[model samples]
Target chain A: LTEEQKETLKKLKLYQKEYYDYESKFEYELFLLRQKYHDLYGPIYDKRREALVGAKIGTPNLPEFWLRALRNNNTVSHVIEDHDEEILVYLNDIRCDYGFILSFYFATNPFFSNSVLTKTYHMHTEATVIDWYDNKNILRDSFFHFFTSHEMIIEGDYEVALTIKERIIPYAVDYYLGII
Target chain B: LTEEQKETLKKLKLYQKEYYDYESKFEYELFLLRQKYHDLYGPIYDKRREALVGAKIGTPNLPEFWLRALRNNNTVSHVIEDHDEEILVYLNDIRCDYGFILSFYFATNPFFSNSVLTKTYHMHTEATVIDWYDNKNILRDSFFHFFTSHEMIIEGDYEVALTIKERIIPYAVDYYLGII
Candidate 1:
């Protein structure tokens, strides 16, 4: 804003001028334009709310049904309802990736949820990721720490399945690790 | 102001938060304090001007000075100095009433040398004041218009003085007149 505009905004924001008075200035000017032509000021008032808050077309927290009722835009309506739920519900499916599972679980749990999402995300993703461990002997040492923290039954018996094959062993290890 | 304090005020006033972060909560606390300590807060921030236009400190254009400042203090400090110069300087020993001429002329200018001081002091004083029309008629025809539609003359013959007065007045009168 220019210096004069800043000063004007400050006064207008602070109620140094009554709210109605500021509203009236715009209203009066629109009336003048309407006089010269029949009506040229229609679009000016449409963007009035944009000046207050830019294009906040629909609120996020309101239920999806209520949102659809208020706004008829099908793309926006679908994105809000089906798209967000797709990500949330699909992550809980049994066949989904464990990294997605861990992030989803860690994001909403009691102990780690209190941390900022970025912090909790880092902690759980680092724990079960095992390319750095390199040897099976140290796998327990790497993945066992979360069991001590979350108290959420983070690990379970799976040694019987691990004995069958190498890739199967890691699959059993992941199941025992409870990342999914 | 501190960056923290600015954020707090913004959170309180600009956003509608159900629960506040540290900065935003301070706005509500300040609002409560203002209501309770109205004497302290009321004058510090005048909402009508949007700036920190101090309460009890009259603006350049308004009549708040004479009614509040002049009636109490003998010498109001907000008016121009040369107001009584034409009559007082030349005609002082000529036994003209200096108070009436000042209340007539000096009382109105927004930026005279010492008008503010004169208005506060001279308003209630009952000495050496003269009138061909009526005693103490200064309040009715002169003082009312002085701060309101009453104009201030920076430099003038009668027509110029009238124009100056109109210019110093705020455009709020346009709304009242429905001319806007």
Candidate 2:
């Protein structure tokens, strides 16, 4: 309010600068939390694939497990075409590098030879190559459209990656159960 | 895998359950980080108000500090009107509860009597009451529209709260510097 109050004002802005420094540390630690937990989460997802996919006996394999989980979320549901389901039915696991590299691991299927599809924002958005089978190119309208064209990945791929890493990958069982 | 590998599958699923619990802890601890740092951030923001608002000496206060920072953000800019800038020029400090209550602190001004305007998602979205000066109702549109209509808070308020809490509230100086 007066010349005396200006003394307090100068101190406050200095305090404000320090707050941002503290806030910067908070974000770094947050990333560390994600990296730690993502490692902890891997084994469970590995088990998910074991019981839910491939050749199995004691427990019958659940068909369309990953397909069901991905389709359950409204944001992810739009990316899947009618034929995309057949390909996604073969999806075995979705993993995160916390780089945070988003990788989709798939089983051997009719549509494509590529077993792993990835969207890496390691530096900038990048997609792994797809080796589609003859006359089986699903790039035009597919669940894996994030890989179809390089330029296409610019706008939409990051949204897809974040949705999967944050939601579909971590809470997959909840998604599979149609609860999320 | 095999009938024997089925043993591994069951174990992995258990691992998955535990991962979710660990993840639950991660989020809670993350909230704790916010609460701690939010208090740390307050003093600086308070000092900002001291030096920037009201009758002061020793330093000439910058005009439209909060207004300029807000409009610089593409997500937040659309909410402001040309007329709203007059009221926003009085905005002295934007504080967070880490609840995270988003409060707009204002100077004693011509347009409105309310000194503090808050949007709280403490439980669900809630708006603090605004007391407008006679014939000066800016609620039809304003930077403070988040308070005007109760029904409006349901959808857009959360988005507004997040942008401020995550970006605008903490990184204010950078925003004012026009670099962020």
Candidate 3:
């Protein structure tokens, strides 16, 4: 059975027991299953399955949320740079929502591919807890973990919005380079 | 009418047409109008009689099309670092079938927000071209001469996903920091 199918069965049993406390329609149950799937399976599916039924959640929204949340809640300190030979610029290291969520999403998604697995990732939250797993194994058994929760600035001006747009576009540029 | 208001009205007319063509629902038309108002007028509504909407069109699905149209689609060069900054990173940038459709959805959606306009974006099959007017006065507008494209690496690979997720994104962090 598909993951969703398997989940449906498990939830069905829970629904039967919990029916006395709270009733749920099949559609709602299905929706919950799907949302849960996205939480557990979605990241992996994004990594392993190679399909994004909701592309925004994977690409722009994933990072966009990080940008907004960070801008709303945190403080930034530095501008770090990547050392890849192919890349040709110095990067920022602001320490806000932008980088935080992106990192979490990367560590979370199974379809993230092999490279993400071998290398270690630092969860961006401030809670002082880390969850690590192999993307390859996610297909056979799902993975989820608590991450450090960092506080970010939530009240920046339009500049925060503008800054995110400028940086994200390059990701597309980088993606294009990967293909050509 | 206020200059910004007048411009908003005219832009509203144009977007109405685009909305009409893009979607086939009355609710959608209303939704697009609300989105434009939120983007342009929301910032200055009570403060000023006029505002700049700055709505431009370049679809995000560029990754899907470019990867397909061009023979050599590649993956993100490096993984973004989780530096507790404003920078955002995409874990697995795949322009597959599902990814393509959802990317287009966000690009067209009126409500998507970004502090930086380009930090988050979509790729168009056509070259980038944008039409803009200021208070019924044409300011600057044109189709972007070229479409920016990205490559898709199958997700779930550790090396490829991590390189871009942790390594590459850090290098370009300055792009957003410069603006932030």
Candidate 4:
């Protein structure tokens, strides 16, 4: 506001410009670190899935691994209803396509013909397609709410994705135990 | 619980344990990446400091650089008083020792003999030894309040520490610009 303050602010901004430059580099370096881990972690995420879904690689099917892991967490459980459990029971594998997309892999069931359903987090916060089987379109009910899209997104929906990907994915066992 | 739930939980835990095994591998790689940038950014942080203080690195000193930055912030400014500005003008650098500790590095001033005054938070409240220059002790003012500790600490104290470290440090430029 004063002559002295105004003069000092310009001097500081010139120096602060250099300060922010280093801060940006620090952020990009950290971003690459996370991005690299996501790439490397992909295969093991599959192995964890196979260990449950009874692929030719594993012994027997362990039913409801993804469902129960999600149900145990408070944030996810609210969005899932009784009928929703029927669909989620068929949810055989859940994995992240990238940092921005969450993929929910499914076993073909009477309710849906599609193999996977995903909720996108980027600005669209969009939902990919799901193919409903004959006479089985729960069209817009239960966890089907996850597929609803809008310019403005609900805090509730974000919490489910955040809880699954960040909180429940790596530490599913602890969350299942209610420790998380 | 159903037998099926227990059986699958057992299977999931076994797989989850392996998930942690690889998690550590990724963890260590990121840690190395982080520490590298931590050192890489050191020079730029030092350069910014030199530019503000009257050094051969830059022109005339920008007095009250830290003081103005903190005062511009709504949260941190609450705890800073007019008198504290006298001591903080000498602050050359602000750094974190272990992420939990905040260190204020001061150029030698008439108010304190120590080069560094740190406020450490670890659940166990610890205050470092601050040797105040004779006749310069406020002992009980806005800035001095940060050095206070107790079995039960004031919530205001934590807010100041949190704002400066989490808020002001990373974006001191924005804070000083009054845009933060």
Candidate 5:
């Protein structure tokens, strides 16, 4: 091999190491964040589910309300193939509706001092908390749904919508993990 | 009109007449077919639904099982937008698992004395009788779902799958209506 090719290969190896380092760190931090959020929010989410389909004080509630809800939903149910139930039981995660205003505040707030405005856009801030049994995993994977319009557009423009979409999660991970 | 223009207009008029004649006849026959199928299979289909999720014997029976099934399916549901539900309520149709044998029969059956073995292929013989609400009009717009192997291959060489994929419905209408 040529000397230049060997040098390029060496650089590539270093770059690859850095990339994996970042990726693994990012995922590990995300897992930690999920744990923290679930620790705080899990009970409230459960209460909401209880209100929706849980047993009442007077009666022994109907069985498998969550399962029925999952089966009834056309969007998610069809993909729940054979024995997927086993996997679903172990599922748990956190969700937050990333909205423009909230994210704008998060970006600009003093609490987030090291924040750089990576991107931004216009949108209305709206949020909802939903808890569902995904497969067998008890998940808190509900998030605030941000909207630019009433329609669920994921495309971002040059403001908070864009900013939040671009960097909020990564920045939060960095900040939370003391890596920033 | 000029002579050339007049000739074109004359041809257009004749074509229009033929088109209208074929269209009206085709629609009328479809209406008849729907009526016949509805009368023949409607009650049996309803009984099945009653058994599945219809009986209010013990718990509250969920209505519209077939509708939910269709809407939940990814490919079909995307087309089933709002107000389309108005039409969906009447779309009671039957579907069968059109495996290799039935299609082989269709392509080769001497009883189908009009059969052309344009495309003959082998597959397992399996069939399912499913009934569902589709639209405002009751229908048995059932189509054969021919399978080739364990892999759910939809492409057919020259028979119903290919025919339906290419121009089966259009060809059938033209042939049956004697407009071809």
Candidate 6:
């Protein structure tokens, strides 16, 4: 190969290595974060679950509070199905500065069926659903969004969930939070 | 409802109507453009196909030319597979600035089985495939990508092909030709 071609090849090799390393690092970091968040939220989740199950019909519970918040939110409540109510009850919400960070970890984990959060920068207004199956169909179906808000719901296979979490979740958070 | 709420609802009705009308107009315009372009390129494509089939091993052919061009292009071609060769032969090339417009149409069409462009884009980079069962996945995947060079491969259903054609193709063409 010519010098430039050789250089390009060398660069490609480096990039391939970097790509692999980057993925490993990303997965590792996410694993670490997920683990940390999981540990942090495990007790809270358990407490809430027990409380939700045992609490009286009129009594306040974590899931109920979240569901109330979700319902109260004007943007996304319309799309909530009757079945989604119970599903939302079990969903975890680690209320932090980056609450969606935790919601994303659970939403994307097969171990956890779903997650809902309102703190990801007014979640209802920009309500976003990501079905990794096909992304463009959503845009084509929707009319021009005037004063419409958004929330994110990413549904995928366990593995595909990782892909979505890594590829999309951060971007979604960043966009709504005006970080990017 | 309050006056503000009523006014907002009225505005939404107006906007939704306009949006529907806008989509209809867009589809019609794309249909006309596609019809025109198809007529314009139909004879040429047929002639080239016949020529390619009839040519000897050493003789030049359209597929060969395209393959050569594709191989030379760095942004694409790396992810091309053995099965893709024959598939690429039939894929349309408008041969204008950013020639993937026609490919987008056929790729998105149910009549056509494959769309190589976006598949390759997602494949080599992330191995993420959007089911097209949901279109929102595409937007959710990419970063803000400011001042990024994009290869618009509108891989969608028939209706979405028009959406892509109207939304991105002209801008892509203009950008490629420095008209934008």
**iRMS of candidate 1, Å:** 22.6
lDDT of 5: 0.32
State every prediction's TM-score relative to the real structure. Answer: 0.16, 0.76, 0.17, 0.72, 0.20, 0.25
- lDDT, model 2: 0.71
Q: Which 10 residues in a row give candidate 5 chain A its minimum summed lDDT?
A: A103-112
Candidate 2 C-alpha lDDT tens digits along A1-180: 565545544554576678768878888987787677767777666667666654321123655667878889887897888888877777777878855678777777787777788777764667787888899886666667676434455656667777898888777767766887
Looking at candidate 6, what is the lDDT of residue B117?
34
Native-structure RMSD, model 3: 28.2
Give the residue spans of candidate 4 off by over 4 A: A1-25, A54-60, A110-114, A129-143, A151-153, A173-180, B1-15, B54-60, B78-87, B106-115, B128-144, B150-163, B170-180
**How well is each residue in A1-180 modelled by candidate 5, as lDDT tens digits?**
356434433443344344445546555755565455434443443433233222111101322222333344333354354444432222221123322333211112211132211222234333222222234222322112221233324432233333333333222222222333
Q: Residue B155 CA error for candidate 3 (Å)? A: 43
**In model 5, which runs have C-alpha deviations exceeding 4 angstroms?**
A49-68, A75-180, B1-180
How does model 6 score by TM-score? 0.25
Which ranking of candidates, highest TM-score first?
2, 4, 6, 5, 3, 1
lDDT of 5 by residue, B8-123 (tens): 33443344344445546655755565445434433443343333322211111322333444454434444445544433333222222212222211112211222212222344
Q: State the lDDT of candidate 2 residue by residue for B1-180, as single tens digits.
A: 466545544554576678779888988988887677767766776666666664321123666677878888877887788988877877777877745677788877888788789877765557887888998886766666677434544656667668888888777756766788
lDDT minimum window of 10 residues, candidate 4 chain B: B51-60
Candidate 6, residues A97-118: lDDT per residue as tens digits? 3323224212232222223332
TM-score of model number 4 = 0.72
Candidate lDDT (C-alpha), each: 0.27, 0.71, 0.26, 0.71, 0.32, 0.34
Docking class of 5: incorrect
Task: Judging by TM-score against the true structure, name the best candidate.
Answer: 2
- Assess the local accuracy of residue A73 in candidate 4 as a C-alpha lDDT between 0 and 100: 87
Every model's DockQ, to 2 decimals?
0.03, 0.36, 0.01, 0.28, 0.01, 0.02
TM-score of model number 1: 0.16
Task: Tell how far residue B25 is off in model 3, in angstroms.
Answer: 12
Chain B alone, TM-score of each model?
0.20, 0.77, 0.17, 0.78, 0.31, 0.37
